[PDB]
């Protein structure tokens, strides 16, 4: 029987590492969605701004026309910030899913090994 109480003693130790490895992946996940929903709004800001001085776009002497180029530059800087921040939230949502399923089947194993 004591060949098996080490297989619960180490199984409990496996859900311990997977719980910390889930809590670390939830802080990383919430951080990312945060920086992203922020940067996605500095983007949509830029794009409405574009549509504001979009009326000047085909008329380079206009001077509101410059407001439209400035708008796009800040949108393109914003767009590369949305792409950086989305890649990282995709990197964090892959490691929340992987850690949720790793924990969840470490618990299934733990429940089989609790069977005395």
């Amino acid at each position: 029987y004591e060949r098996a109480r080490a297989e619960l003693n180490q199984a409990n130790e496996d859900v311990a590492r997977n719980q910390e490895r889930q809590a670390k992946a939830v802080q990383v996940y919430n951080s990312r969605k945060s920086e992203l929903d922020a940067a996605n709004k500095t983007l949509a800001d830029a794009i409405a701004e574009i549509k504001q001085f979009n009326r000047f776009a085909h008329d380079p002497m206009a001077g509101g026309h410059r407001m439209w180029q400035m708008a796009g530059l800040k949108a393109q800087r914003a767009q590369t910030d949305v792409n950086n921040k989305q890649a990282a939230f995709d990197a964090a949502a892959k490691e929340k899913s992987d850690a949720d399923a790793a924990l969840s089947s470490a618990m299934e194993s733990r429940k089989k090994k609790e069977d005395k």
């Binding site: 180029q69 796009g72 767009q79």
Partner: peptide
């Protein structure tokens, strides 16, 4: 430049 590489 802008035509090719801008946001537009």
């Amino acid at each position: 430049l802008g035509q090719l590489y801008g946001f537009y």
